[model samples]
Target chain A: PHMRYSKVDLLALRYEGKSRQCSTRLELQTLGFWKI
Target chain B: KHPLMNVWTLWYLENDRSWEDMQNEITSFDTVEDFWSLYNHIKPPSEIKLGSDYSLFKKNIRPMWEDAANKQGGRWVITLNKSSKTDLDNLWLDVLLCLIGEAFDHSDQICGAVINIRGKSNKISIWTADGNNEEAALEIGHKLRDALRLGRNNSLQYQLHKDTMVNVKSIYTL
Candidate 1:
């Protein structure tokens, strides 16, 4: 779900300090369990 | 406007010397009066230094991706160029008003908003409660663009925070 993914991205952005922008995009995809 | 369903919390991120030290929850307000009190007391969004952020979200929900309630949601981002600084104050205030006033027809789908001040380039985003609901998502996006009176040439994009977690090498260009 998008809501679940949104939560994950926000978490990643908060916790992961290095490359936050990239981390945010990657986390969003990860939450959706997408390959790329 | 109708009263909100829940009390929302407002947070500030001041860029301290250290990244770890940068994470701070400035304050939380539940009442309309309290919200304005804080707003009036603090420096306006345009006055904040680069790398700082102002986030407003549901009371229990923290303004980070790690929060349980926000892990699955995504944000619709609006990037502002250097030239837009002239109007940043009004734009930021508009966003705050939207959140506090519950301006969207699908207000329940909204989580909150964040304004990132980066000196030359500022960004504002409306965080919605869901990411997969394309219909709701697009509707909110359209409303946001319209309410903000963005240029017809201006473009915005929606991103799920989770995807940003792993790759950490992406950009949202629309």
Candidate 2:
């Protein structure tokens, strides 16, 4: 598919793209990143 | 290591490359210690060349207007004159802390923030989703003013992306 993805291709790879694994800004509020 | 409430992505925009090439995704961090480590490793905002910008946006959002999350938003723009030049680094850092710390009650409304270092005057802007909503935009703008502890005299304006690109006027100012 010739979709518009070049911009976020790398980002999509590092994080998930349109997948359940993706995280948003609010998610970090309750679920912390790296724990002590 | 002390973890953060959320993960934020850092991007660098430089004039040397094409727009596509310019969107360099630096890295993302979700821990307090890791955030500092990244900060220390990179050049401070003031040191970057004039045509460059340092942007920290929410994890899934990129630093571009075309981005879905950014397409329909406005920014709380703060311009710093030569008198406040020295405070650039601290100001930028503080903005990041507030963002990752989820400082605002309407935190989800925030898209990202940018630090633009230009010749006339350096500028900082906090981008928020849904620019049309005057109520939410104003709330975010007022809260950001205090979160950065901007002096009462310090003035900032909110400009919608739709208007900013085509020489149109700003929507609302705070």
Candidate 3:
């Protein structure tokens, strides 16, 4: 079988609770990813 | 005791039914000692009720998108079925060890990890600093698979932050 490749990026939008606040744009690259 | 390259932070989210109170930031810690102390003090992931999340990230790096460090990055996700909770905990621990132990050769590319305990299934992900770095990205995925002792038959998926932000669908697949 042939191997497949995919890319993903996760950006934190807004965390809830006491720390509920907008994350800085620079932090977008730090969240997580998806593979397909 | 193991030496860590950098200090990390841990945060917890307890799910609530009320939309008004759906999300909350539980706590955070800064050092290896602090992390273990906190980890030991808290309820294990298996004990926490469904619809909860536990996130571990670099200090000052919020677990949400609006943060500067996570804005452009994405995650490699592993969704565990109901029967996989045992494996989930094991896999999660492995991921944690990788994060604090600096298991990845491209450790700098890693940002953190997240475990979402949903009503039905649980999801775990390894966050990376950049979406475009294919070499680092693939390495992270392979390393996670090995660390978790996942079989060759099992696979994981990667999704971009931007895609998730715009599209609510769970785009990441294995």
Q: What i-RMS does every model get? A: 17.5, 15.6, 16.6
Q: DockQ values for all predictions?
A: 0.02, 0.03, 0.03
Q: List fnat per candidate, in order.
A: 0.00, 0.00, 0.00
- After superposing all C-alphas onto the true structure, candidate 2 shows an RMSD in angstroms of 11.6
Task: List pairs with backbone clashes in candidate 2.
Answer: A28-B5, A28-B6
The positional error of residue A22 in candidate 2, measured at the CA in angstroms, is: 25
lDDT values, one for every candidate: 0.65, 0.71, 0.64
For candidate 1, what is the DockQ? Answer: 0.02
**1 against 2, candidate with superior lDDT:** 2
Fraction of true interface contacts that also occur in model 2: 0.00
- Candidate 1 lDDT tens digits, B1-174: 113345777677875556655655555655444555456555677667677788888777778777776677788888788674358878787777667666666777788888888856888988877777777778888777877888877777888888757623223434
Task: Return the top candidate by lDDT.
Answer: 2
| Higher-ranked by TM-score: 2 or 3 | 2
Error of 3 at B25 (Å): 4.9
Position B5, candidate 3: lDDT:
66
Quote the RMSD, in angstroms, for model 1.
Answer: 13.8
Which order, best to worst by lDDT?
2, 1, 3
lDDT measured at residue B68 in model 1 versus the true structure, 0 to 100: 74
Model 1 lDDT, residue B80, Cα: 81
Off by over 4 Å in 2: A1-36, B83-86
Kindly list the per-residue Cα lDDT of model 2 for residues B56-168, writing each as its tens digit: 99899988877999898889898898565458888887787767666676777888899997998898999998888788888888877876777878877888888887844
